[PDB]
Structure formats: structure tokens, C-alpha cells
Write an enzyme that holds these catalytic residues in place. Structure first.
Site, PDB file in Angstrom:
ATOM      1  NE  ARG B  23      -2.329   2.142   3.802  1.00  0.00           N
ATOM      2  CZ  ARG B  23      -1.384   2.387   4.704  1.00  0.00           C
ATOM      3  NH1 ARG B  23      -0.366   1.547   4.860  1.00  0.00           N
ATOM      4  NH2 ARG B  23      -1.455   3.481   5.455  1.00  0.00           N
ATOM      5  CD  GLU B  60      -0.812   3.149  21.975  1.00  0.00           C
ATOM      6  OE1 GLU B  60      -0.281   2.084  22.343  1.00  0.00           O
ATOM      7  OE2 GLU B  60      -0.910   3.459  20.779  1.00  0.00           O
ATOM      8  CE1 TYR B 146      -7.012  -1.660  17.861  1.00  0.00           C
ATOM      9  CE2 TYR B 146      -5.342   0.073  17.724  1.00  0.00           C
ATOM     10  CZ  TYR B 146      -5.900  -1.104  17.240  1.00  0.00           C
ATOM     11  OH  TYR B 146      -5.379  -1.725  16.128  1.00  0.00           O
ATOM     12  NE  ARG B 179     -20.797 -19.027  24.244  1.00  0.00           N
ATOM     13  CZ  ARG B 179     -21.946 -19.532  24.677  1.00  0.00           C
ATOM     14  NH1 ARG B 179     -22.432 -19.170  25.859  1.00  0.00           N
ATOM     15  NH2 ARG B 179     -22.593 -20.420  23.935  1.00  0.00           N
ATOM     16  CB  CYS B 198      -2.780  -3.372  13.034  1.00  0.00           C
ATOM     17  SG  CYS B 198      -2.482  -2.348  11.611  1.00  0.00           S
ATOM     18  NE  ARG B 218      -6.114  -4.330   9.545  1.00  0.00           N
ATOM     19  CZ  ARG B 218      -5.229  -3.721   8.762  1.00  0.00           C
ATOM     20  NH1 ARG B 218      -4.623  -4.410   7.808  1.00  0.00           N
ATOM     21  NH2 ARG B 218      -5.002  -2.420   8.875  1.00  0.00           N
ATOM     22  CB  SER B 219      -1.458  -5.718   8.778  1.00  0.00           C
ATOM     23  OG  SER B 219      -0.354  -5.194   8.071  1.00  0.00           O
ATOM     24  CB  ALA B 315       6.648   2.773   5.558  1.00  0.00           C
TER      25      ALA B 315
HETATM   26  N1  LIG Z   1     -18.831 -25.175  14.254  1.00  0.00           N
HETATM   27  C1  LIG Z   1     -18.596 -25.511  15.505  1.00  0.00           C
HETATM   28  C2  LIG Z   1     -19.592 -25.233  16.459  1.00  0.00           C
HETATM   29  C3  LIG Z   1     -19.319 -25.614  17.764  1.00  0.00           C
HETATM   30  N2  LIG Z   1     -18.179 -26.206  18.083  1.00  0.00           N
HETATM   31  C4  LIG Z   1     -18.024 -26.518  19.483  1.00  0.00           C
HETATM   32  C5  LIG Z   1     -17.154 -25.514  20.231  1.00  0.00           C
HETATM   33  C6  LIG Z   1     -17.531 -25.877  21.656  1.00  0.00           C
HETATM   34  O1  LIG Z   1     -17.004 -27.200  21.910  1.00  0.00           O
HETATM   35  C7  LIG Z   1     -19.063 -25.967  21.673  1.00  0.00           C
HETATM   36  C8  LIG Z   1     -19.681 -24.568  21.758  1.00  0.00           C
HETATM   37  O2  LIG Z   1     -19.473 -24.091  23.119  1.00  0.00           O
HETATM   38  P1  LIG Z   1     -18.865 -22.717  23.552  1.00  0.00           P
HETATM   39  O3  LIG Z   1     -19.781 -21.568  23.282  1.00  0.00           O
HETATM   40  O4  LIG Z   1     -18.559 -22.691  25.003  1.00  0.00           O
HETATM   41  O5  LIG Z   1     -17.607 -22.615  22.813  1.00  0.00           O
HETATM   42  O6  LIG Z   1     -19.278 -26.570  20.313  1.00  0.00           O
HETATM   43  C9  LIG Z   1     -17.190 -26.493  17.177  1.00  0.00           C
HETATM   44  O7  LIG Z   1     -16.156 -27.068  17.501  1.00  0.00           O
HETATM   45  N3  LIG Z   1     -17.438 -26.120  15.869  1.00  0.00           N
HETATM   46  N1  LIG Z   2      -0.198  -0.826  15.592  1.00  0.00           N
HETATM   47  C1  LIG Z   2       0.232  -1.001  14.361  1.00  0.00           C
HETATM   48  C2  LIG Z   2      -0.259  -0.138  13.363  1.00  0.00           C
HETATM   49  C3  LIG Z   2       0.227  -0.339  12.081  1.00  0.00           C
HETATM   50  N2  LIG Z   2       1.106  -1.294  11.820  1.00  0.00           N
HETATM   51  C4  LIG Z   2       1.498  -1.402  10.436  1.00  0.00           C
HETATM   52  C5  LIG Z   2       0.781  -2.524   9.693  1.00  0.00           C
HETATM   53  C6  LIG Z   2       1.086  -2.105   8.266  1.00  0.00           C
HETATM   54  O1  LIG Z   2       2.509  -2.277   8.068  1.00  0.00           O
HETATM   55  C7  LIG Z   2       0.777  -0.604   8.195  1.00  0.00           C
HETATM   56  C8  LIG Z   2      -0.731  -0.373   8.049  1.00  0.00           C
HETATM   57  O2  LIG Z   2      -1.087  -0.736   6.683  1.00  0.00           O
HETATM   58  P1  LIG Z   2      -2.240  -1.692   6.235  1.00  0.00           P
HETATM   59  O3  LIG Z   2      -3.596  -1.098   6.439  1.00  0.00           O
HETATM   60  O4  LIG Z   2      -2.134  -2.034   4.795  1.00  0.00           O
HETATM   61  O5  LIG Z   2      -2.040  -2.912   7.016  1.00  0.00           O
HETATM   62  O6  LIG Z   2       1.254  -0.201   9.563  1.00  0.00           O
HETATM   63  C9  LIG Z   2       1.606  -2.149  12.769  1.00  0.00           C
HETATM   64  O7  LIG Z   2       2.440  -3.007  12.499  1.00  0.00           O
HETATM   65  N3  LIG Z   2       1.133  -1.971  14.057  1.00  0.00           N
END
Ligand SMILES: Nc1ccn([C@H]2C[C@H](O)[C@@H](COP(=O)(O)O)O2)c(=O)n1
Ligand SMILES: Nc1ccn([C@H]2C[C@H](O)[C@@H](COP(=O)(O)O)O2)c(=O)n1
EC number: 2.1.1.45
Lengths: 316, 316
Positions: B23, B60, B146, B179, B198, B218-219, B315
């Protein structure tokens, strides 16, 4: 062989997992944090050490891709994976007039003649859903399920966002984006949700002309749940890459609470004595492209030779 | 030593990473899918092979915990980590009357006398924010950051959910819940968001009386970003466990696009020639409990002896 990672996850939990009491109340052995990857260029990660019904995997996947949330579609596809949830609302509601289908999930498994009563009432509900348009619309719609999460996320200002739809276009125009995410976790629905999404969120990635997907699963039933999941998301990875005209890369499965229910131990140990067979091959209808328009005959699983199936009690 | 995983991630990208255009446009070496864990019972994962400013990390973090989104708070804490984003809106807006602070992010780094002009205008904006209540409220509030994601998620029906707040109570009453998730990704804001989160989402886990947290990023900028991140979330894991009265477990860092910018290669190779020192120790004010009320003097980092700092171009 391709499925080894799964075998190693099962071994791992069984050897290193600590006991953890659980929600359902049938204790588990669990580990927190795990990641395993499958190179989709080697074959399809459908378990051969245990028979897994692919047909149920795809009919359920197509259901998601249509942004559908109604149980009726699956029923006409002989898929009964989500009947229980629909039955739940129906039984615990005004119209239900019949036996004490309360707490049916356990009492059925226990042993009573109740199993027939339950299975009959269910068989009944199922036929209604499939033919009574008002009933289907009232009791067959599960509402917030993967289909609506992926394809009709509810905006605050009362609207609908098609996450997956938008993400596919992104992969088409900006393949190197680090923002190709599709989330199923909505903070406002989970507080009072039946079963908050286990397949919490996934991310796409493109480079070298290959598409990869990483799934974050907050909770997983190694034995009953993971097998299906690996296949469902490996299928998705193929479909999207077919739409976008990319080659398939890997499938990465990241777990939160990876767990094995105590009453699955013997069964899992059965699997562990088997040795993997060559991974099956998947082929999509070369003509069709808009995966949203994909139909079941458009997906094929060439030569899959699994060991027989293994039976084990469900825990909910 | 505790920080080895990070070193191995850097080595890994540098050796196995494939080039991927990006990017910002200053190509990277990247891998998709990675996970590393730190056993918080051994010490605090603050990098010793390179000086990391902890004080900026905590000010922060406290800002996040207050559900605060205003830049003013950080400024009175000498933290300027988010000034740029505030400046962005301000400069590209009606009131801004002054030099061509457009595209300041690159032109400043380039070389011109502009650096002084930019740094001056920024210094100016910064003083306004810190003393002009109407200005602070207008240009210092970043909005969706955040703090608001964790503590004031916007419901569809125009309301506010305190995710992190609710999750802490859950850990207190139902420690074995699968959960315990806190998500920062909102499908409706990301389409037109400056920088979608991120640190996408994290999950808590309790067993054996120890608390663990897994973050899905994610990145990641291995060099500039990861170091701070590991510390910020390791701090969180300690705080929450202090509130809930649990022992600290591990910190698990899962990545999507783990990457190293090409112009960071020499610098990273500098780090890789150093050998880790013993991990520092962290201690929280034993009296205070409601972490939301935590203040900076309530957090201490005992004996941290890092190698000097390493400089490298940003960057964005
Ligand atoms: N697609 C799914 C749906 C459910 N479960 C499993 C996760 C847990 O074993 C239970 C759901 O309980 P909990 O909400 O506590 O995770 O069912 C799973 O493995 N894959
Ligand atoms: N807390 C953060 C914020 C940003 N970035 C980095 C991730 C990418 O290198 C760029 C954000 O670009 P993009 O949206 O494409 O991931 O900055 C990171 O490492 N940690």
C-alpha cells in the site's frame, strides 16, 4: 500426508492438554493457542482416517454463500445440521402443542422412549418447514447465522453490508490488501446469542498469484468439529480463488480453545491408530464463475478413500 | 531468553519471506500466518536487543482503558504516537490557514526545510489541543480508535457497549468461558476508516488459575510495530489478571500479514547480531484493583537493561 497436522493436534491435546471444566459440563482436555496449515496445492484436506460427509459440508457452505439463514434450504438438501436450533425456538413457543420436548437435547441421548417422541416431533417440524411457507418464515429462519453475518451485516443506521461480497471485489482489484477480513463477531448480538460464532473471523491474503485464508476459531471440538471446519474453509478458499482467477495457496487454522471432550478419548485413540491415505482431489465446474450462483453439481470430490466412520456422543 | 520468538520471526521473514508490493509502496518481505507465545511467568517481553520506550506503551494503554479517544490525554503524557492522525483532519480542513501541510508525511521525511514548517505547525496544533477546550473537542478526538472500540462500541439502536468491561466481569464469574472475546473490527466503519485496526481482536482464557490472552493481528510491521504490540498486550494481560485476582499465563501473538519493509533490512540485521539479556520484571501497585482507575505510577518496570535503540524510517 496432508491431514497430519490434525492428527498432531489430537495427539497434542491428548498428551499436553490440561483438564478444563466446561459449559456443557462434560469436562475437556484443552490447549490455548494453536495454528496449523494445509497446502491446498497438494490435495483437499478432507480426513481419510475417518469418513466425513462432504455433501453436508458443501450444502451448508452454499447456504452461507447465498446469505440464506432459513433451514428450509438445507432440508431439501437432506442436511439436518441446524435443525436443533430451529426446533428449540419452535418447541419453546406458543404454537407448540405436544409432548414435553423440553431439554430434548440430553433426554434424547439418555435412553428413554422419548427418543422416538423427540425424533417424531422433529420429523414433524421438519415437514412443516419444508411445505408451509408461513411456518418456514416464522420458525425456520435462524436469523443471525453465518449467512447473514457474511452477507447481510446489520449497520447501525438500519442497513445491510455484504462483507464477503465486498471482500471478493477487493481481492480482484487490490490483491495485496492486508485488510481482506470477514468477521462474524458482532459485539451487540453475542451477549444474548444462542451460540456465538466459533469460526469468529477469517482473513484473505494474495501473493505469488496464490490465495490463502486464515481462520480464527475461538473454540473447537477437535474430534467432532475441526474435521468439518477444515473442509468447509478449504472449499471456500477454492471457490473464491476460482472467482478471482487465482491459484490456491494454503489454509491456515488458528485456534483459541482447542479441546477434546473427555468422552471422545477412546474414539480419538481409534483414529490415531490409522495411517493417512492420499488426499482426495476437488474440481469445480470450469464454466461457472460467480460462486454465489454455484450449485452442488458444480463441485466434485475425485477419489476419496477414507477408513470407516467413527461414532461419538454430541455435547451441547 | 523470553524474546527469542520475536528474533525467530524476524529471521524467518528475512529468510523465507517473499516480496510483496504494498500500500505505502515501499515493498515488503512477508509471510502469512504465524503464532508465537511468551510465558509471562518468566518476565516481561519488552525487547532488550533494542531500546523500547515503555512509558509510551503504558500511557497509550491507560488511554485505551479509559475509553478515551482524545489526543489531549497523551499530550499531557508527552506521548505523540497519534498526533499525525489528528493533524491530518485539522490540516485538511476549513480552519487550517498556513503552509501547504499537504502530503506532510512524506515531504517531511524527504529533506526540505519543510520539516521545520511541518514540525512547527504540528507543535502549534499540539499546543491548541492541550489548552483550547473547543479545539480539543473538535480536532483532538479521533473518534473510532481502540478506546471507543474496546469500551464504547456503537450499537445499531444508537447505544454503547463496553466490551472489555463486560469481558472482565465474565472472567470473574465464568472463568472457563470460551467466549471471552474483545473485537475491534466493525464491518460498518472499516470501509471508510483511516487505518482499520491492526490488532483486530483478542481472546482471554483461564485454567489452572492463570490468565492467557491471544491477539489476532491482521497486519504487522515486524521491525517498528511488533515490539510495541507485544509489550502493550503483555501489560493488558497483567492488569486484567490483577483485577480478577489470577496468576499470569502466556501471551500469544497470532499474525495475518507478518512483514518487514525492505528499507528496514539493515536495521533488523543489526538487531540479529545482538544476544538477548534477562527479561525485565513488572510490578503493579498491590493496593489498587479497578484497573480502569490505574495511574502511571501504579505500574513499574524493574531492571531493564536493553542495548541502545535502532533508528529506522516510518512508512505510512
Ligand atoms: N462449528 C462448531 C460449532 C461448535 N463447536 C463446538 C465448540 C464448543 O465445543 C461448543 C460450543 O461451546 P462454547 O460456546 O462454550 O464454545 O461446540 C465447534 O467445535 N465447531
Ligand atoms: N499498531 C500497528 C499499526 C500499524 N502497523 C502497520 C501494519 C502495516 O505495516 C501498516 C498499516 O497498513 P495496512 O492497512 O495495509 O495494514 O502499519 C503495525 O504493524 N502496528
Amino acid at each position: 500426508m496432508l491431514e497430519q497436522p490434525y492428527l498432531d493436534l489430537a495427539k497434542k491435546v491428548l498428551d499436553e492438554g490440561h483438564f478444563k471444566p466446561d459449559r456443557t459440563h462434560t469436562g475437556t482436555y484443552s490447549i490455548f493457542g494453536h495454528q496449523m496449515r494445509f497446502d491446498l496445492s497438494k490435495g483437499f484436506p478432507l480426513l481419510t482416517t475417518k469418513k466425513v460427509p462432504f455433501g453436508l459440508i458443501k450444502s451448508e457452505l452454499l447456504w452461507f454463500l447465498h446469505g440464506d439463514t432459513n433451514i428450509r434450504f438445507l432440508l431439501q438438501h437432506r442436511n439436518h445440521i441446524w435443525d436443533e436450533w430451529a426446533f428449540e425456538k419452535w418447541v419453546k413457543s406458543d404454537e407448540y402443542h405436544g409432548p414435553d420436548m423440553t431439554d430434548f437435547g440430553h433426554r434424547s441421548q439418555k435412553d428413554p422412549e422419548f427418543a422416538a417422541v423427540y425424533h417424531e416431533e422433529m420429523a414433524k417440524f421438519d415437514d412443516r418447514v419444508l411445505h408451509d411457507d408461513a411456518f418456514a418464515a416464522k420458525y425456520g429462519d435462524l436469523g443471525l447465522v453465518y449467512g447473514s453475518q457474511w452477507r447481510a451485516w446489520h449497520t447501525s443506521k438500519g442497513d445491510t453490508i455484504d462483507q464477503l461480497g465486498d471482500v471478493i471485489e477487493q481481492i480482484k482489484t487490490h490483491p495485496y490488501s492486508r485488510r481482506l477480513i470477514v468477521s462474524a463477531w458482532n459485539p451487540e448480538d453475542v451477549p444474548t446469542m444462542a451460540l456465538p460464532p466459533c469460526h469468529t473471523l477469517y482473513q484473505f491474503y494474495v501473493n505469488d498469484g496464490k490465495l490463502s485464508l486464515q481462520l480464527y476459531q475461538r473454540s473447537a471440538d477437535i474430534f467432532l468439529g475441526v474435521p468439518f471446519c477444515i473442509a468447509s474453509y478449504a472449499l471456500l478458499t477454492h471457490l473464491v480463488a476460482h472467482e478471482c482467477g487465482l491459484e490456491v495457496g494454503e489454509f491456515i487454522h488458528t485456534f483459541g480453545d482447542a479441546h477434546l471432550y473427555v468422552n471422545h478419548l477412546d474414539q480419538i485413540k481409534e483414529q490415531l491408530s490409522r495411517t493417512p491415505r492420499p488426499a482426495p482431489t476437488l474440481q469445480l465446474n470450469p464454466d461457472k464463475h460467480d460462486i454465489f450462483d454455484f450449485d452442488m453439481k458444480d463441485i466434485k470430490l475425485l477419489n476419496y478413500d477414507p477408513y470407516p466412520a467413527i461414532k461419538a456422543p454430541v455435547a451441547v
